[PDB]
């Protein structure tokens, strides 16, 4: 909305390209560490997003073997990074928080 929020977004795009998982074709939610909440969220993904996640991880592990990366044209653009897992993970956490609040009574 203002010039300063474009600088916060500017450094986020810098850190994104510095993190470098976009160089392997991955997305941000492909790189998340699998705890119990994350495992449930992945379990709830529809068939198409699960199969897409599996191939990107498979392709990135194949690149990591060869110590290679994709061409720059095929890197994951910061503007196009889809948080496909966050709505599922937010709901799994919300349910656990409810179970943990009933356990207090």
């Amino acid at each position: 909305v203002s010039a300063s929020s474009r600088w916060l977004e500017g450094i986020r795009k810098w850190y994104y390209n510095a993190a470098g998982f976009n160089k392997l074709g991955l997305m941000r939610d492909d790189t998340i560490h699998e705890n119990d909440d994350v495992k449930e969220a992945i379990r709830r993904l529809p068939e198409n997003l699960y199969n897409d996640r599996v191939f990107r991880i498979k392709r990135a592990l194949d690149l990591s073997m060869r110590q290679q990366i994709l061409p720059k044209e095929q890197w994951t653009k910061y503007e196009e990074d889809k948080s496909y897992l966050e709505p599922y993970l937010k709901e799994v956490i919300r349910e656990r928080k409810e179970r943990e609040e009933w356990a207090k009574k």
């Binding site: 998982f21 790189t31 699998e34 991880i57 990135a60 592990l61």
Partner: protein, 378 residues
């Protein structure tokens, strides 16, 4: 059906070294698991063959070692393999641990904490081995370290005199260190089997920190040949030290017999203890030095509790990578300071590096993982 899979004995070897699903992308930093296994075996064979000629008595402990390098057939090659094999053991241990910090393998709690126990028992093993030749540094290294236990409140002296078997490092201390130096490597090997028991429950991590169940390969032939190649490089590194520079890592004082009266000028440990020797001398207080000296290694058991990043491996975390190499360079600073006298400006540098060590592990590196989470918006 298949004999390799159904026999009670071969199925354990098969499900550990042959048909084990391993990640397709583990790098050279995963070779140090097997190399540690080789070093442990290598130290036991040479260690045993030295015990066929070594005697654990002060009147002949120094000369029995001399008797090996001069009169015993290929005794000199067996000894320097043992002394340098210990150093290669600690090279591999530090690569092995550093691989676990960088790539997040410590999230395997049971595997990691048993690793910490393996690090402590290997350190205790080498510490007692260095006493056995009974040189100058063998005696005075044992004196300055065991005296630290007297700083424990209300049971200090009673505990030190019990470990000594007297009132100082003496005949009784030399003999039991040989017995303990003998028993421990087998206790180590058993704990290394439990180290693998908990590992195979989950399989290996990989450089990305992402699960590799979608892309696994059998351990044979891909990682049997890769560990063989890595083992061949290990023999190159060992034999270069044994056949061209067997006295590079050792101290010349240990070629002088023990002398409780005459003290050498500079009492320095082997290179793989200098970082902790520096942390000891940088703390003025005595009891505070022991706690910091023990906390320098027990801090590894706290790393899983201090993990803040939503990502497992540092591969995708630049701000944590810089702090990781700040920990290595800071440890390379403590190593350097440890082999230098306690004088200006090394006193101040050793104190700064000591605080930077615990500050990097407890405060800075956890804070970086949180900053990295915010930059990715989670």
């Amino acid at each position: 059906t298949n004999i390799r899979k159904s026999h009670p004995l071969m199925k354990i070897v098969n499900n550990a070294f042959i048909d084990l699903p391993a990640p397709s992308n583990i790098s050279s930093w995963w070779n140090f698991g097997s190399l540690l296994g080789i070093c442990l075996i290598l130290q036991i064979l040479t260690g045993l063959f030295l015990a066929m000629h070594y005697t654990s008595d002060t009147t002949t402990a120094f000369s029995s070692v001399t008797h090996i390098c001069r009169d015993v057939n290929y005794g000199w090659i067996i000894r320097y393999m043992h002394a340098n094999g210990a150093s290669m053991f600690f090279i591999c241990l530090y690569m092995h641990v550093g691989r676990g910090l960088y790539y997040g393998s410590y999230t395997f709690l049971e595997t990691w904490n048993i690793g910490v126990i393996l690090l402590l028992t290997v350190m205790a093993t080498a510490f007692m081995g260095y006493v056995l030749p009974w040189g100058q540094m063998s005696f005075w290294g044992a004196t300055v370290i065991t005296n630290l236990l007297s700083a424990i409140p209300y049971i200090g002296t009673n505990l030190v005199e019990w470990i000594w078997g007297g009132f100082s490092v003496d005949k009784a201390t030399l003999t039991r260190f040989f017995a303990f130096h003998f028993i421990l490597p087998f206790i180590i090997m058993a704990i290394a089997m439990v180290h693998l028991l908990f590992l195979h429950e989950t399989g290996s991590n990989n450089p990305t920190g992402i699960s590799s169940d979608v892309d696994k390969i059998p351990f044979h032939p891909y990682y049997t040949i890769k560990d063989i190649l890595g083992a061949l490089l290990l023999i190159l590194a060992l034999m270069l030290l044994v056949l061209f520079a067997p006295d590079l890592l050792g101290d010349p004082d240990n070629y002088t017999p023990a002398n409780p009266l005459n003290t050498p000028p500079h009492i320095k440990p082997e290179w793989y203890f200098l970082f902790a020797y520096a942390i000891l001398r940088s703390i003025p207080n005595k009891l505070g030095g022991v706690l910091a000296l023990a906390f320098s290694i027990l801090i590894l058991a706290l790393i899983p509790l201090l993990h803040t990043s939503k990502q497992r491996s540092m591969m995708f975390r630049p701000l944590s990578q810089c702090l990781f190499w700040a920990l290595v360079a800071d440890l390379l600073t403590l190593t350097w300071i440890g082999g230098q006298p306690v004088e200006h400006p090394y006193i101040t540098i050793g104190q700064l590096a000591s605080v930077l060590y615990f500050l990097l592990i407890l405060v800075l590196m956890p804070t970086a993982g949180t900053i990295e989470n915010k930059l990715l918006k989670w």
